[PDB]
Amino acid sequence: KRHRKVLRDNIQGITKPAIRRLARRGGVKRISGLIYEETRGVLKVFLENVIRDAVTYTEHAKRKTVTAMDVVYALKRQGRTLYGFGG
Amino acid sequence: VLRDNIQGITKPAIRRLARRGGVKRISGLIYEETRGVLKVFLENVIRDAVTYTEHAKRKTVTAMDVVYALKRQGRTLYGFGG
Amino acid sequence: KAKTRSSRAGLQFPVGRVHRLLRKGNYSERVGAGAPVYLAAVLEYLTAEILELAGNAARDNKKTRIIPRHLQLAIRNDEELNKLLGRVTIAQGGVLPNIQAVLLPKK
Amino acid sequence: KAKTRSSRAGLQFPVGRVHRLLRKGNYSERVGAGAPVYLAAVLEYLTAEILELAGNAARDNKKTRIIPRHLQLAIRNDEELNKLLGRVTIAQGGVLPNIQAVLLPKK
Amino acid sequence: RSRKESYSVYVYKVLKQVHPDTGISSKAMGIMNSFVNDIFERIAGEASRLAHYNKRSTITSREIQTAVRLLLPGELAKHAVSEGTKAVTKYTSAK
Amino acid sequence: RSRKESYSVYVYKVLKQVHPDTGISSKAMGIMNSFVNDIFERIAGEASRLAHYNKRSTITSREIQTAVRLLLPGELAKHAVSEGTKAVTKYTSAK
Amino acid sequence: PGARLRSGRSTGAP
Amino acid sequence: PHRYRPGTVALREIRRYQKSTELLIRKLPFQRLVREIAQDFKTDLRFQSSAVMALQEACEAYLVGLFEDTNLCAIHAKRVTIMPKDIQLARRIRGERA
Amino acid sequence: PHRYRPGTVALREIRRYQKSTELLIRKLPFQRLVREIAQDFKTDLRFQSSAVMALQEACEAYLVGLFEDTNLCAIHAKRVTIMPKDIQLARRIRGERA
């Protein structure tokens, strides 16, 4: 077949400018240079937790495809209830 | 020599709570601020408890009324049933 | 002479549907005749409250079509809807304009 | 002729009671044969874990009777039990000895 | 093409009652849908528990009503209780 | 004068397996009761949701196991899943 | 063969 | 004439109260405060003994937690004295208001 | 040549991003990061495109919320610059950590 291209270091696609923008929406005026790496770490932890729960629902359903509903159920469990994607 | 029930929560008692919380030094404004927070906490829990009482057509607030109220206010308590 | 329980009760919200969802959701063994009517009415009340305020946010922003931003402005500017929905995220809602005073310039 | 579902499953926790509490609980219309076995085993495991570590805490205070203080010490001193019970108050548990370093006297 | 059902039809009626010249995007409708399912579950859930807490096997308007007093804040509860007490009393005395 | 059920008898047995010389206070036993009832509700709760999400009328070992994976941290989940599979094994192998 | 804890202690034997 | 320096008894109280589990508010003042607040919701109300104890347990655990978070906010600002703004910031980030 | 003083463009950006609702992380990078983390839990996973958008909407709303709390922590320490210790204190008080 083709087998997937290897995925490494994708956390670095969360660029300094993208984090500045998120900080601005959150009302931040000045940013220490150390904030970018600290934000990537906090983001990885948050995604790993939500994906681990979403994939657990995917596997329980005996599916290979993660649905919007799997993510929505994982976010609800995590107390980060999301409107706009069903349920 | 009569005073509010809230002031029954005295400086030395609030000072003991802080101490179990690992506080070394306390501004004098803390005592009134703490009484404020305490009132709100008890308001919010006693409201929900009493709503449980009324639903059960009772005139006595049970431990269960309180435990059920604490649970839904996200302060689950262990050791009084449920 | 088929009347919907909605029309009997004077509600836009479907009492039928709500009775069923209470049935299939395993909330209790049995569901009273009152329950669905009361619930459909509360849900209808709340959606009317939100659409009133979001309607106003649409009109304020010189718009005819309510978008998620208008629902976010409506909910976040209302003390009670904000508390009811304090642990909810509205996709494409954004945030309220709010700058901490110390961050503004000059003396 | 009668053997408890517990004695078959190798458990101290009551498989029969758990089965009934699942029925009278409106969790689902029906209940697989295993579900109450598993559930009762999980609850027995977690009970053993906590009574293990609480026993240790009891012994460490030169004590042979577990009290709430011993339960609080066991739970809050274990990363995993502490997370599982993060939003829970053990009545009469007090807190862990913890003084922030900057509050210690200079010499 | 499996019939997947929503509260759209009823949300749009209520939109037209309160703001007769106003539209709603499908996203906004998506949110209004999430909002109805969410408050439904929260109220049904409180009611479920409330009944179990009182060794009852029936959810009546009385369990819904208490659930609304527990879930909604002050004024929304007041008004919500009115519309539900009304809608019932009417539904009863419309037979 | 009516029967007030608890898990006390079972907590006391598991205590004797784990710490044979060790006793337990009335208040400590009340906390252990609260504990079992709480984890009971959390796990049944997730199982109920799992079944409802998958349009199933039935909570099996599989819904309990997924519920445990969602609710227990790391090593607690691992060990709990293994105690649960083991007890279902032993019970299926019992004439 | 009873209940195995994380510490590596068991629950007796039969 | 021997006098302990500021903070030396404070530390001793910290060590003492973190070691114990006794309720730290007097029972009767608390009971009175419960009954007052409750009166505003339903009158002629009775309370089980255990109901009031449940409330005091929950309420003291809550305040002790809040003082810990408050202490971190004070220490954050390079102080060792807790102030209203420290309680207020702890409540804000916990999502108890604002 | 004429320069804005430090902070003038930062305030311009706060006003602009607080007015808008667009996702602020690039779509493709964020999708790769989702696929990487998911792949490390389970190989041979696919995603509904709406799953990834749901994750992205949930991640941005979380980080925005966290930066508001972090900013309150910097301002409580009498700074205007957020530092790691502000995020850490926010997360500790949110009970996202011990």
Add this chain to the structure above:
DNA sequence: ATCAATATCCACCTGCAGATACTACCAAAAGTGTATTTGGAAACTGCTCCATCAAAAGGCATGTTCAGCTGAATCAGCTGAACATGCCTTTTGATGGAGCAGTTTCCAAATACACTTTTGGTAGTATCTGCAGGTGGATATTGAT
């Protein structure tokens, strides 16, 4: 307080993307209107345990003295903002390929249900004892000198 660089506002002006609004249309669900089941409000009463109230007991209100903390003022080093410049990667919008969700039909296990047989678990009770006080005397800690 003057001036110029540059951001911001607002009113026009498009072309769709996405909204609204027909259908016809049908399939599932809601409704109807007896046949059957039963849960819960009703009424009664007993016996807990809650409110009250009067001696026993330490905890708290108080005012004074000053240790040391908070916050103000100042300053220099250097971090982080702004911005210009160069160009890599994301966005966008196709096309083709298939993996896999999602349906719909037989059922042989699997679990519910109705009834009977059995006993584990509860509530009185009835003993047993872990440990919270208390005392004595050694040593450690703190703060004066």
Add this chain to the structure above:
DNA sequence: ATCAATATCCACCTGCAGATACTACCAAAAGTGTATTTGGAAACTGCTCCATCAAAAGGCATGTTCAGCTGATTCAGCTGAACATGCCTTTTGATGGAGCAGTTTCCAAATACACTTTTGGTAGTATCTGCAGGTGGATATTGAT
């Protein structure tokens, strides 16, 4: 340093509150035997997800420059910690009855069934239209001087 005041620590003691242990009674778990419901196994869709690629805005990286923020230093004044007493409030221990909860009784209310009718979904079609994105040109804000 020394010197003393007070706090803390460990051994031993012992009364009884609060455990563990024991018994008979019955609610609720298990046993058996039909009565229903389900959740794969097979076998097909079309949906929609992966992939790959081409062309071009659009945002990213990096290096330079200096404004001004952070945090170190110093210091004065005020604000909390400590402490010595007695009185006032709480804690303790001993009675009347409110009301919880035990329980049985019967009907108003909810289920079960199987009809008939209607709503709400969707697919398809067209049919409309709000507004995003663009472009000038008039107006506001900022920062040098």
